[PDB]
Design a protein around this ligand. Sequence first.
Ligand SMILES: Cc1cc2nc3c(=O)[nH]c(=O)nc-3n(C[C@H](O)[C@H](O)[C@H](O)COP(=O)(O)OP(=O)(O)OC[C@H]3O[C@@H](n4cnc5c(N)ncnc54)[C@H](O)[C@@H]3O)c2cc1C
Lengths: 6, 133, 666
Amino acid sequence: PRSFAV
Amino acid sequence: RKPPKGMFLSQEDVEAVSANATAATTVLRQLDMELVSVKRQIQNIKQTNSALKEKLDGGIEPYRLPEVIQKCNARWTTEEQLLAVQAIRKYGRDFQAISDVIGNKSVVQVKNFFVNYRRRFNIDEVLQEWEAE
Amino acid sequence: PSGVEGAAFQSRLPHDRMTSQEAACFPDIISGPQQTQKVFLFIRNRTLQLWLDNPKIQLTFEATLQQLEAPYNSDTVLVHRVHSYLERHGLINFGIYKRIKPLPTKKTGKVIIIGSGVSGLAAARQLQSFGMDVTLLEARDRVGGRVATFRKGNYVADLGAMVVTGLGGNPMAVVSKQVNMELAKIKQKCPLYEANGQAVPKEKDEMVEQEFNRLLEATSYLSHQLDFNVLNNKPVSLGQALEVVIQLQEKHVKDEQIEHWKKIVKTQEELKELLNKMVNLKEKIKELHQQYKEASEVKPPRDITAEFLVKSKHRDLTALCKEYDELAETQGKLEEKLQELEANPPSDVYLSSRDRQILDWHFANLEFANATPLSTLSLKHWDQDDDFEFTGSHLTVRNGYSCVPVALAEGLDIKLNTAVRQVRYTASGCEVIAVNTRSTSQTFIYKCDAVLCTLPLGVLKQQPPAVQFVPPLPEWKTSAVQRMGFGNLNKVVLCFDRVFWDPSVNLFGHVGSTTASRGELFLFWNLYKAPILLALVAGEAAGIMENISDDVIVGRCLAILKGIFGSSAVPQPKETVVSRWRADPWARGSYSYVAAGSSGNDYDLMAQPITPGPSIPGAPQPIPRLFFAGEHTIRNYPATVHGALLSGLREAGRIADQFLGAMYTL
Ligand SMILES: Cc1cc2nc3c(=O)[nH]c(=O)nc-3n(C[C@H](O)[C@H](O)[C@H](O)COP(=O)(O)OP(=O)(O)OC[C@H]3O[C@@H](n4cnc5c(N)ncnc54)[C@H](O)[C@@H]3O)c2cc1C
């Protein structure tokens, strides 16, 4: 999901 | 509510860029051509204006006539009257031009003249013949 | 938040409002007077607080009532209803804790759990807690599933789950107190390095990133405000939307230039008309001068008409000279107005080939986050789980994430090397047929009351099926399986004998050469004690790189590293591991995503249990038999460890209610 994005 | 400021997205534009498979590249091509089309039209008129600028070289300096500084006078010399009658024939009702020609008469004195010597210089006839041209 | 209200937050519940699940178990309370509701809410919050304050020991009903005050400790059955509810649905007493009440003498009901991933294990522990007979069937020779940790000597690196995405409301926060996880914060500073191997200037790095963020908000605007969600009967993807937005931005750049030069031609054309007027005036001034000159040849004394001619032509000359000066005045004003516009033009291009490449890294990041090409993600829903994101710093399990599933596995009947081939469910019960992965002709049969399926979505997607359902899964279930997206992302573990990177930096990016390769080794992680660098293969690259040998991949890694740190500063790696998740038969990918044409609602469909038809025709409606947990079944926390964990807790609750009854609903 989005929350993984650096 | 509104797109990020600087980001441009309108209902009309989205439909236009997605209308088909390559409508995106089509619209961007028309503008690329429109840009070149306008860009060469600039250098064309830039060239035209450059040539016209070369003709005006020197300005109008060799054609200027020195200032005629003379104080305004109350008396109408016979000369000034004859100058007036002729100026009326050439300029009509342009009291400014007639004032400049005579040299030492104010725009009002010119208008006074029109009334003062109206009968004796048939200024009616003189004016109606200026209108005839 | 802190106190009793903070415990509700740390348990993902509103502190001052009753949840939909709570309304179902306590319909008496929520339909009742507002006073009672607030009593209920405090009891719930306080009990949660008690559990959270010390999650290493079981919280009994006795211990709970002990620490409650008046008037809240007066109604002992309300306290018992609440405590039982919280225990059932795994809000309290979940994970690994000392049991005050020893396990029930004999077990009630029998559950077969397919897969010993985190979801499987979390459910197993709960069901055993509820005094049920539980056996997990695992195809692998290890527990954890997509929690895979490489271990050799001192080298420790996660090939699966790696990051704890914030402790704020995270069930993993509880687990981290129960299990010895060495949690280390990740400093989010990430320097980029272009293809040549040189740092992106802080000038660009910020001006590109800002544009990226601006581009995402733009897609969101397209999605919600302009309702750009279906194009040519197909659902619009995030990729499509990003392309459309960029194109419209390139269009604006050209529209601006066109109307700027269009401003110039109009000024230049005003100058043209003014110059033409000026040449025609000098023409007359030139001739009128000659006439005055010829009129001045008549020397005095002269008659009055000859005198008039001199005077007249004099006036007419200074009159036209007056005009020319004013026209030369205007010429100077229009001429500087042209130097104004030619001085500062609008932007030349929207993005350069250098800009567009750095932007592609930012897209690759997103493709890593969702483990998929942005051309597959749902425009409207790709980020629907944003609202439920945790708070706090992201952390890494420095001693390897596997420490968790292994800890959860302690004390459970787990059959390793057991590949489920067929699930049979009928009104009277279930039988599960599995084989031994080592010698496949050896067959096992498992009889049970209920089956909990934690098969990865990729496995469920297999064509032809790896697991057969008897009878076939209903239309609505299989449609959800096809619609939903199951992504792919891979890791490269590089183990060196010495640190040659910036030890204060946790992660650095590499900018690819093309759009096509934007995900190829695009990011590196420095997280572990030992000198280990971990590289990501994301997006489209992820899938293609699986058909390429480890040596070649490790080569490309060193290449990039040499380019950034110095050709003779990067040694040969002592140990290397390369994941292939899409290739892996027990995963068939990395984790799910919201595909275009799917929604968060499909995740709900995945969680819905199956109830078989009756045996005898005309016999009453049976019990639900087949249940589903897993990362792909939790709408609000998909594609995560905590999400799986929670889905397991969810199903254990639902199964226990079904087969042991809910005494707390009265
Ligand atoms: C590269 C990568 C990085 C990740 N990083 C993160 C992260 O940083 N943070 C995060 O929160 N999450 C992360 N995840 C996701 C997370 O690991 C998973 O969502 C979670 O572990 C899934 O647990 P599960 O129990 O739902 O599925 P799984 O863990 O896959 O469990 C399913 C089990 O079923 C078994 N199985 C499959 N087929 C059969 C069969 N026929 N018979 C018997 N058993 C079978 C499998 O072997 C497996 O053990 C990552 C995933 C990947 C691939």
